Write a protein that binds this ligand. Structure first.
Ligand SMILES: Nc1ncnc2c1ncn2[C@@H]1O[C@H](COP(=O)(O)OP(=O)(O)OP(O)(O)=S)[C@@H](O)[C@H]1O
Ligand SMILES: Nc1ncnc2c1ncn2[C@@H]1O[C@H](COP(=O)(O)OP(=O)(O)O)[C@@H](O)[C@H]1O
Ligand SMILES: [Mg+2]
Ligand SMILES: [Mg+2]
Lengths: 484, 96, 275, 173, 200, 97, 137, 195
């Protein structure tokens, strides 16, 4: 029964029914359907007197996520809706429309919404002749302060995605996420029952409270979120199933707040291995910006006092926002229609950007004299390639252009570099601060080359700019004592 | 049997109160003031309208909720800055 | 009729038929001086570098002789290699390739494996209705290769079983009124991660691995993979990976999903050189 | 077989297996050896448009070998179950290449087989084309069969189905 | 081998063919692929240089008729194939441009950036040629008129885009937006083609 | 979840928050239980839902609970001179709800 | 006049498009300050790829693509300038590269200043991440 | 191009309707254009003869071109007379004849489907028979003829074909498929017969 229709404090009630002929294999578990049938009765010989087992004989199914598989892994798309999808694909502002159509009740978070769009689209799966394959899913983690609608974002993603499973961090076991070996009560034989993430095959799993993964349960997903396969060797059963799922995880940095005063590795208990599989890692922070606070408060007040149900409907009718169902069908059509591949110029740009990013990580680790908790590796380049493919796919472009490369680089810098750019000798910094305070006059300025000749990375100048005692104005060629 | 509505209200005062709450929380404060806390004001106002069997949240139901929220926040702060915080917040609990 | 298609090629058996032309070409290529290097590099072209790892893999796939000495003495001829390295260093992809290439390769995950399901399971028959044993992951891989990913994540209680396997190539069962000794003369390849998120070169290679040194001893080779951030090497890796990712299948168009049907069974059954 | 037929142009550029008859010098521009010549009795795949001329002018330089698409295995498969054959997987332009191969070789038996295959599949594609879905307010079989068609069958199907849809639309307007 | 550029070009051409084939969306031509044109032109120029090289080297050197004939013949066939691919692509673009010109002569004269200068001049002169044909001898009939039979003479229409007031043949039409006329289909065909009246 | 003693399969039974759905849940000594037990109520007190993904049973219950908790200040006495976070052992997300 | 000219913005792929409101309607926008040198770069790049390649045919390598290459020969079309560090470099949409101005032979029939875009050629070094330039024009 | 692709070698149903619109049919004029012995403008057309139109007499059956009759039927100023094949008895006899001979088509007028559709749409109240029965019998004839066509398709040779007594609309709707399949079968045979 529908969870929204259960009685208060009551577990959902199951009910058996039978399909027939052309109605067989019409739907799959986890799908929401409506049935018109006959409420029939049969007497099972398996504990009162004159009791009778009730059931339904089916005479009609009305689903919304198509037949078995994803419309049987082929297009069940009528000509009118297909042509509508093509027309939507030709919209130049389609990117902005999709971004605005992601969590309308959630104010701001534009980059997060764009990353969600990329995830829902996903890259193009590659299968090489030599045998090994290249996955086309995007793994995104959302860290940050509590109360930033991350759980709301995961719930919306689960709502909008054609295939989506929403799970809680604490209420999650490794045997319940991928596969459970269970003994058949009648035949006394063991068999495998698909786990939560398996039910999300070809879709997405939204794991809230990602920080509440049991360490023995979190590791069990390492193989399947990367190899897209699950290997089970239990109770005489040795199988390797496929799980081509997207992963959207919501976690919390230690201490509740991020606590940027501590080291970035201290705030994140997740090891480098699990962080390596994840493609995008957003870190949201509560700016406590009073004007931003006012804007969010106004948006939330409009949300509560019935104004949301009017403005969202009006804006959706305006055409800059679109309903959940139409986005679901459009995403399905785009994923089943296009598998874009990169252009050689895009490949050169991506290689250059990857080398730049690795050099940046190397210099950051050298300055910190410590391995960065954020790993940047070849898998990150694969993530960028997949995001470029998703950007080309949502436009139904058969080949990815450098516009997609630029946007993917921007999103990567906005999320993964933002995570990797977080910072917690001091004697040199203090000496430089004091010498420039005593030398550089309070109301005057001097060129940066003067400081270079006087004499490193010279993060002291950036720290003082944070303190608003110095300011770089002439394109970094002139440092002026701002008045402090 | 009561489902009060927040049609009669002034979003300006609530927005300013939430902004000031966040401003004083980030600056010399440890109480987390998030959007959930802003929703708490409307929830308490709804409860106030419920206990009067009112189907619409009156102005008193909003001012009482705002005063309760700001007092609970202030009492959660150290006494050293508690007097200054109360002095700042006194302009919002007018009438009671 | 039963036709044993195997080797994951969808149409050929594991014991692939060898034509006289193929045998002659094999003999001719055996006279090549660096045929070893050619075969090693030809193993995983899509995997950049890791040449010595490929050499070790080729040695594993076709290993040395097993000495069935007298007085019960037995010297195993299989080669077992444990390769531990940084994340996203193609550690799992190498094992996937070996699985796709080896004649008898069985995949295993340290988290997704139980010792009973790894060696032998005491089930009950249904046709007769009485107790029976069912082969695990290594018994089925007898004379084959077992690719174990997330090796450090394996349960310790069931890790002694694989230790006994790689020690003496035989498992023993003494439960449920069944006292047997099964033979699993497999070759073991394992992929492992450091104790920390990354390898610490400042520490000896004992605390960097969460496995007993006795367990490490039975492995013929232990390969350390370090994801050191270079610039020229990183550029070469990026270019190679992009060349790989821009590959297009012959019977496929650009911007077209790679659908699979595998209905290539159009008929059922049997129906010098320097490259 | 018109000059500007796009399908014909695409079908011309298809590689076919063929051995050599002479140790011709200086060839191999992109055949793995630009300056190095091409040896005698060398089996290589060449585009059909070029292999056609190379198979006639000479003993001809090139001896064409029977392609996999016309092997006895595919012939038996066609003779067994023409309807359930995924001809698109075999090739996107199978019928045009069959026509060209028969025209070059005058191989009557292949023509006899392909004509029967074409007739049997034409029956089913006409069955599908004249079937028009009606909304009570894209059948599974229709789509799962459409994927097993070459471009010409997909073109005849489009034209016939368009004619049927126009007739139905005009009739019930 | 050598026809890969032409193969990609003709693949894109057939892609555009299916693109315009679906319904009657009247989309503009995809941007002129001057990149592939220049690449295959450079290939043809290099092959022509190779032909001249082989000819002069055979004249100065001692090359038998076998190799000199064979390599030259193969390269000539290569130019034949590449030229045929280019011809097919250009012919497709020309015919689709003809479709746009014929349908839109009474509709609109338009993003031209997708076309090369030769194609733009071709369209500009082809409109002139079509007008010359319409005004030459068959001027009594409208050669650009609708190809659907005139089943009905009097129809009702609704104004989509307000155009103020437009003088018809005899009276005048006040194209007030959201207003419905019921007039002859004969004298409103051009307005409906432009997109001002919608109802049938 | 638990294996049924009579029919031998996993079945899910609701906890304290399920029986308090659309009601009230009271937590005495909120500072004194295990933190790993205390973190199991985040979805329950914010999303008002319980998601279980264990033993092949995957579902999302609804718990519209009104959580009321009672705790004890660090050392048994509340030091008013200190910030509230220093007088408690709990974190921001548990304090935020 | 300067305010009566045709706004000719060159589409980076291949086009020179045309662009053509109040008292403060003539004030240039921030994006215009961004692209005032983007357009100059693009026009000079068009001039280079139309003239030099047809007259002289080793091409222009983007600065961003000079990272992993160790000591190869490169020709760059880049805006000569002095960095905030006070050393000479070339700016480009792909990136910027510091140049070893020593051991360089320019064309003597030109004036060279900071702010003019030049065609340098030389060998890149990843060890110092500097382009040792030998010829420039 | 000058001719759109979908009009290349077949007729659109609108073209078939227009062609059939020129067939002469007998109608009852509701006006009387016979200028008495004791002004007015004659039709004086050039695609047909104006003599009957200028000499129409109220409630006196004449024969005029079909589309003029439809134009008059836009008003109540005329009335259409159904042809003799549009009676229930004749339709039943044709049904029995079709069911009796499975290999040959009925001898209906070539324009029966389009005529039935036009008369049902625009002259729905000029039939002595219940229109709800005429529609059903017309649909039944269409289904039976379709069934016969499908069985006659299983003998698509490569030389020729004889579709005897078949109607016009069915031929028009089957032209693009049959004329294209037949071309491929002929081409295969000719390529085989290249000796
Ligand atoms: N930018 C925002 N726009 C709208 N609502 C927001 C925004 N940020 C936070 N909220 C609200 O704040 C609440 C956040 O609750 P959740 O999403 O369940 O918790 P969370 O933000 O995911 O952080 P956790 O789960 O405690 S680590 C919801 O009521 C959101 O609607
Ligand atoms: N040397 C390499 N050459 C090519 N690809 C590599 C290399 N090293 C790592 N990769 C890429 O990294 C990705 C993840 O590798 P994975 O098997 O997960 O390594 P690990 O098991 O160490 O995490 C693969 O898709 C692979 O393409
Ligand atoms: Mg949350
Ligand atoms: Mg791996």
């Amino acid at each position: 029964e529908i969870p929204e229709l259960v009685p208060v404090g009551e577990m959902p009630r199951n009910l058996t029914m039978t399909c027939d002929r052309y109605l067989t294999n019409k739907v799959i578990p986890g799908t929401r359907v409506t049935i018109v049938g006959i409420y029939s009765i049969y007497n099972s010989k398996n504990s009162g007197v004159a009791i009778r087992t009730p059931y339904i004989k089916i005479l009609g199914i009305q689903s919304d996520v198509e037949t078995s598989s994803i419309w049987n892994s082929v297009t069940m798309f009528t000509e009118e809706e297909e042509e509508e999808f093509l027309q939507l694909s030709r919209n130049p502002k389609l990117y902005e429309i999709l971004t605005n159509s992601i969590a309308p009740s959630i104010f701001g978070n534009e980059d997060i919404k764009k990353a969600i769009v990329c995830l829902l689209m996903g890259g193009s799966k590659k299968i090489l002749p030599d045998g090994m394959r290249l996955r086309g899913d995007i793994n995104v983690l959302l860290l940050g302060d509590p109360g930033t609608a991350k759980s709301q974002l995961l719930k919306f993603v689960e709502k909008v995605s054609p295939i989506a499973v929403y799970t809680s961090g604490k209420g999650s076991s490794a045997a319940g996420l991928t596969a459970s070996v269970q003994r058949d009560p009648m035949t006394r034989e063991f068999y495998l029952e698909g786990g939560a993430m398996v039910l999300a095959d070809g879709g997405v799993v939204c794991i809230d409270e990602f920080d509440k993964m049991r360490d023995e349960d979190r590791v069990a997903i390492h193989e399947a979120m990367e190899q897209q396969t699950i290997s089970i060797a239990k109770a005489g059963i040795t199988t390797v199933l496929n799980s081509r799922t997207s992963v959207l995880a919501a976690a919390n940095p230690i201490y509740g707040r991020y606590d940027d005063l501590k080291s970035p590795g201290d705030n994140i208990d997740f090891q480098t291995t699990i962080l390596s599989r994840f493609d995008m890692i957003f870190i949201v922070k509560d700016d406590h910006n009073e004007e931003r606070d006012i804007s969010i408060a106004n948006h939330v007040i409009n949300i509560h006092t019935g104004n949301a149900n009017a403005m969202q409907n009006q804006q959706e009718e305006n055409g800059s926002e679109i309903s959940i169902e139409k986005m679901k069908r459009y995403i399905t059509y785009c994923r089943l229609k296009c598998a874009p591949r990169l252009s050689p110029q895009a490949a050169e740009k991506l290689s250059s950007n990857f080398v730049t990013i690795r050099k940046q990580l190397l210099i950051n680790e050298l300055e910190s004299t410590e391995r960065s908790s954020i790993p940047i590796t070849i898998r990150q380049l694969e993530a960028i390639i997949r995001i470029t493919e998703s950007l080309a796919k949502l436009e139904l472009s058969p080949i990815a252009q450098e516009r997609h490369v630029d946007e993917a680089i921007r999103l990567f810098q906005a999320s993964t570099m933002d995570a990797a750019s977080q910072d917690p000798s001091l004697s040199e910094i203090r000496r430089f601060e004091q010498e420039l305070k005593r030398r550089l006059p309070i109301g005057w300025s001097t060129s940066y080359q003067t400081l270079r000749r006087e004499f490193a990375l010279d993060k002291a100048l950036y720290a003082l700019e944070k303190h608003e005692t110095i300011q770089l104005r002439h394109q970094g060629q002139n440092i002026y004592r701002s008045g402090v | 049997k009561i489902y009060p509505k927040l049609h009669q209200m002034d979003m300006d005062k609530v927005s300013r109160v939430y902004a000031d709450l966040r401003r004083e929380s980030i600056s010399t404060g440890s109480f987390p003031i998030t959007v959930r806390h802003l929703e708490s004001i409307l929830r308490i106002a709804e409860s106030f309208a419920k206990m009067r069997l009112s189907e619409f949240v009156s102005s008193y139901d909003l001012d009482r909720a705002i005063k309760v929220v700001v007092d609970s926040f202030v009492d959660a702060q150290k006494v050293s800055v508690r007097r200054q915080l109360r002095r700042s917040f006194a302009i919002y609990t007018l009438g009671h | 009729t039963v036709y044993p298609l195997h080797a994951r090629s969808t149409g050929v058996a594991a014991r692939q038929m060898l034509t006289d032309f193929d045998i002659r070409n094999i003999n001719k290529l055996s006279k090549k001086k660096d045929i070893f290097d050619i075969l090693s590099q030809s193993l995983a072209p899509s995997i950049y570098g890791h040449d010595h790892i490929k050499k070790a893999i080729l040695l594993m796939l076709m290993g040395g002789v097993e000495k069935n000495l007298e007085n019960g003495s037995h010297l195993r001829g299989d080669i077992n290699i444990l390769m531990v390295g940084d994340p996203s260093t193609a550690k799992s992809q190498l094992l996937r390739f070996v699985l796709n290439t080896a004649s008898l390769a069985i995949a295993t995950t340290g988290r997704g494996s139980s010792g009973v399901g790894l060696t032998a399971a005491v089930t009950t028959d249904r046709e007769t209705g009485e107790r029976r044993l069912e082969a695990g992951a290594m018994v089925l891989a007898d004379r084959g290769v077992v690719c174990i990913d997330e090796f450090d994540k394996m349960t310790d209680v069931d890790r002694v079983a694989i230790h006994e396997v790689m020690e003496q190539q035989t498992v023993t069962i003494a439960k449920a009124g069944i006292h047997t000794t099964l033979n699993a003369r497999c070759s073991v390849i394992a992929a492992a991660n450091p104790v920390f998120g990354q390898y610490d070169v400042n520490r000896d290679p004992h605390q960097n691995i969460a496995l007993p040194d006795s367990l490490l001893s039975r492995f013929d080779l232990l390969f350390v993979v370090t994801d050191d951030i270079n610039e020229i090497r990183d550029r070469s890796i990026s270019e190679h990976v992009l060349r790989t990712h821009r590959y297009l299948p012959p019977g496929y168009l650009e911007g077209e999903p790679v659908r699979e049907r595998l209905n290539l069974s159009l008929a059922v059954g049997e129906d010098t050189e320097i490259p | 077989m018109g000059y500007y037929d796009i399908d014909d142009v695409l079908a011309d550029g298809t590689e076919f297996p063929c051995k050599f008859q002479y140790d011709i010098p200086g060839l191999g521009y992109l055949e793995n050896n630009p300056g190095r010549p091409i040896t005698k009795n060398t089996k290589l795949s060449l585009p059909l448009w070029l292999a056609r001329i190379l198979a006639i002018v000479g003993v001809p330089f090139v001896e064409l070998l029977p392609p996999d698409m016309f092997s006895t295995k595919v012939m038996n498969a066609i003779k067994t179950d023409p309807v359930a054959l995924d001809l698109h997987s075999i090739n996107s332009h199978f019928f045009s290449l069959a026509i060209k191969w028969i025209m070059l070789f005058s191989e009557k038996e292949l023509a006899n087989v392909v004509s029967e295959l074409l007739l049997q599949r034409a029956q089913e594609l006409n069955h599908h084309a004249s079937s028009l879905s009606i909304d009570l307010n894209t059948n599974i079989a229709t789509s799962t069969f459409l994927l097993k068609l070459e471009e010409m069958e997909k073109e005849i199907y489009k034209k016939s189905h368009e004619s049927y849809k126009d007739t139905k639309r005009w009739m019930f307007k | 081998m050598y026809g890969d550029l032409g193969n990609k070009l003709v693949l894109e051409a057939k892609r555009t063919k299916q693109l315009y084939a679906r319904s009657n969306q009247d989309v503009n031509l995809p941007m002129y692929h001057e990149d592939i044109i220049r690449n295959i032109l450079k290939e043809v120029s290099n092959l022509r240089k190779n032909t001249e090289y082989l000819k002069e080297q055979q004249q100065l050197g001692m090359l038998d008729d076998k190799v000199a004939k064979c390599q030259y013949f193969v390269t000539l066939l290569c130019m034949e194939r590449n030229k045929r691919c280019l011809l097919a692509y250009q012919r497709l673009r020309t015919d689709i441009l003809d479709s746009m010109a014929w349908n839109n002569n009474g509709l609109d004269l338009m993003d031209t950036n997708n076309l090369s200068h030769q194609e733009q001049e071709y369209l500009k002169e082809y409109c002139d040629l079509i007008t010359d044909l319409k005004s030459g001898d068959l001027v009594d009939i409208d050669l650009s008129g609708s190809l659907v039979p005139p089943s009905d003479v009097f129809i009702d229409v609704r104004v989509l885009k307000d155009a103020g007031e437009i003088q018809t043949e005899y009276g005048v039409f006040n194209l007030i937006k959201d207003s419905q006329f019921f007039v002859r289909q004969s004298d409103v065909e051009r307005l409906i083609q432009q997109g001002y009246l919608q109802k049938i | 979840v638990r294996k049924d003693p009579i029919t031998k399969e996993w079945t899910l039974e609701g906890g304290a928050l399920v029986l308090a759905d659309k009601g009230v849940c009271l937590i005495d000594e909120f500072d004194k239980m295990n933190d790993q037990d205390r973190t199991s109520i985040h979805e329950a007190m914010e999303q008002q839902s319980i998601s279980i993904s264990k033993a092949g049973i995957v579902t999302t219950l609804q718990a519209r609970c009104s959580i009321i908790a009672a705790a004890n200040p660090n050392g048994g006495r509340y030091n008013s001179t200190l910030p509230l976070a220093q007088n408690v052992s709990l974190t921001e997300p548990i304090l935020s709800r | 006049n300067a305010s009566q000219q045709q706004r000719f913005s060159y589409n980076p792929h291949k086009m020179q498009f045309i662009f053509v409101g109040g008292i403060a309607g003539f004030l240039p926008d921030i994006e215009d300050k961004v692209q005032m040198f983007l357009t100059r770069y693009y026009l000079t790049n068009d001039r280079v790829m139309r003239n030099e390649n047809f007259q002289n045919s080793m091409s222009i390598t983007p600065i961003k693509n000079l990272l992993g290459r160790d000591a190869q020969n490169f020709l760059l079309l880049g805006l000569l300038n002095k960095n905030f560090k006070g050393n000479w470099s070339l700016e480009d949409p792909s990136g910027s590269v510091e140049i070893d101005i020593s051991q360089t032979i320019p064309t003597q029939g030109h004036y060279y200043v900071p702010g003019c875009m030049v065609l340098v050629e030389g060998i890149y070094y990843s060890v110092g991440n500097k382009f040792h330039v030998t010829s420039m024009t | 191009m000058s001719l759109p692709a979908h009009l290349q070698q077949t007729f659109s149903p609108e073209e078939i309707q227009f062609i059939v619109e020129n067939e002469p049919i007998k109608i009852f004029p509701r006006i009387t254009t016979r200028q008495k012995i004791r002004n007015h403008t004659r039709w004086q057309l050039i695609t047909t003869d104006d003599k009957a139109l200028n000499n129409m007499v109220a409630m006196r059956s004449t024969e005029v071109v079909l589309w003029i009759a439809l134009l008059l039927k836009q008003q109540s100023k005329c009335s259409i007379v159904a042809p003799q094949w549009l009676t229930t008895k004749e339709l039943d006899r044709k049904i029995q004849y079709e069911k009796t001979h499975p290999d040959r088509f009925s001898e209906l007028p070539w324009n029966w489907l389009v005529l039935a559709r036009i008369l049902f749409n625009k002259a729905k109240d000029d039939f002595h028979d219940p229109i709800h029965e005429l529609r059903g019998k017309i649909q039944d004839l269409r289904e039976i003829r379709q069934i016969k066509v499908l069985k006659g398709l299983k003998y698509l040779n490569e030389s020729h074909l004889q579709l005897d007594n078949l109607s016009l609309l069915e031929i028009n709707e089957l032209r693009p498929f049959i004329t294209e399949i037949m071309d491929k079968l002929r081409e295969i045979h000719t390529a085989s017969l290249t000796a």
